[model samples]
Target: SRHVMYKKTSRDKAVSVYLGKRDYVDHVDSVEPVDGVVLVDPDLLKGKKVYVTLTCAFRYGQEDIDVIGLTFRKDLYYARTQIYPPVEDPKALTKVQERLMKKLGNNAFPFVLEFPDFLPCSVSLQPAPSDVGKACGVDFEIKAFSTNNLEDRIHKKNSVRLMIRKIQYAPDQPGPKPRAETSWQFFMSDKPLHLTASLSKEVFYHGEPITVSVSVTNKSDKTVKKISASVEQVSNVVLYSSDYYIKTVALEESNEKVPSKASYNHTFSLLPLLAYNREKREIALDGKLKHEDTNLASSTLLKEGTDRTVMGILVDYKIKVTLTVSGLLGDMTSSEVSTELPFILMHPNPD
Candidate 1:
């Protein structure tokens, strides 16, 4: 024969009891059991001591004595406090309380508690149906059990000794130590080279040509070869219509096979200047050689832009020269040198 499922007949039965310190008890309002679950009003138990008690209930059985067993375990639960809004301003505390209550319910249920410095505490509820030694199930009926009498008897008549301990606060301790140190050394040297340059004229008419010349000598005891010189222009000042003339000059040393000194002259000319003002004209010059080359070796003009400044204005100029020298051994060494110079245009005042 199959057994029939019974509707829950006990709606007012006590589910569980908790015994904690006195401070937490005042915060607890009321306790009740719902669908075989115990709920405590934490508002009444806040700042209270911790304690424990047993819950009892009636049960049904077929052929044997029916019994119900309760179990307890620790767990963590989170709760939010209230919020208040003022006349001048509204507090968001009420919203926080409503959110927490809606999520976790307005009762203090068994929950695990975790805090910094303190070990996490675990707590859980044990329903009558799940207890190992209990025979109560869905077809059973539960009667009301007294929670108040049990709490009072335990605290007064039982005369249980209560001890409270205060927690400690201390600064963090220092960590590991340090280790030993060490040291090191090295050197550097360079040979000086002679260089000379000359311009056809320091000043040129607006449309006249300007030429430049360069010379070099190796003061070291070595044969030098493969010498070349180059010229370029740079400028920051804006030119209405400026132009540039570039020239390269190669020199054959006196002792071509093992030259101790070398000299070269290159002529560069700038002509056909348009509307340019010398007061506002700024120019820079730069050069590079085969021994070593760097972009930073270039120079720049400091002049500002003008109203009629066009593209490709010759703002500045540069010169670069290189030479190879024979070392003491059969080895050969090369040296590279560069120079940057600036030129300004003559600006005429309005008549």
Candidate 2:
């Protein structure tokens, strides 16, 4: 008996085959064709690339010939593979404020402010009507002030001024009508004058004890005085919430005034009484501090950490602090500024 095997090549319409007697099975099996489609005994070619080949044999004074082949390059019949679609650059979306007035409502536009050695800053929009209100929503972009270019300027508390553009929308008009545009200047500093809050422990089991801390720093050249702080737990707005219990162990500021480059810290604890998942929790803090010729007030709220539990979660815990100082030349009016810090809580899962 004789056998045949075919092998495929890279080009079309070309194939190779091998021919041999049954006793030469090992020799024929090892033969591989250089090109074209290939066909072989299913058992012999299992899990192998298809190739075409011709087999010829001269044995027992007889001539035998056979052509074996299989399909080749199915990939050519299929469309090219693509893992992702082409994407447009986000900066391309950066358009002159004038082009977006129709969609953005009336008075929407951009204004630029100048700062030394820093990229010009621009406020891309002004407050417009949203479901919320005359919500003062604005988009801002900073050039030359990116982390790579103006790291020093950012660290020095330098900022560029921004202008406000007002838009008017009427019931009958086709769209918002641009009414006025004005520029204003604001400062941005890399100073650590920000407040942050987080859970002391990242993980917590039901009935596990957890602590929450809020930290504040004064990165300005002035001393902060008359510091005050407070914390509150916001209610769970959804069903099947975690039932983690919490109490404030302390909420007092240090008697010592925080000087420039100084910081203050406060902490609270949560003690779960029942088996309840730490769903979402809220912690809030607010206080006053003195800064230079003025007193400043600030507030912050922090939400829950990534701890899973069974009962329920709390959320929207906020902290706010304020400082008072002489307003404009001994006028005795105190200016106060506040900010919300993030907070966390635990809650129950819904069925």
Per-residue lDDT, model 2, residue 343, is 32
Q: TM-score of every model? A: 0.24, 0.23
**Candidate that scores best on TM-score:** 1
Cα lDDT, all candidates: 0.27, 0.26
Deviating ranges (above 4 Å) for candidate 2: 1-192, 202-210, 226-230, 236-255, 265-351
Number of backbone collisions per candidate: 53, 121
lDDT of 1 by residue, 2-112 (tens): 122112211222123221211110001221111111233333433333332221211212111132332221211222111111013222332223333344354423321
- What is residue 88's positional error in candidate 1, in angstroms? 72
Those runs of model 1 whose alpha carbons end farther than 4 Å from true positions after fitting are 1-191, 203-210, 235-258, 261-314, 321-335, 344-351
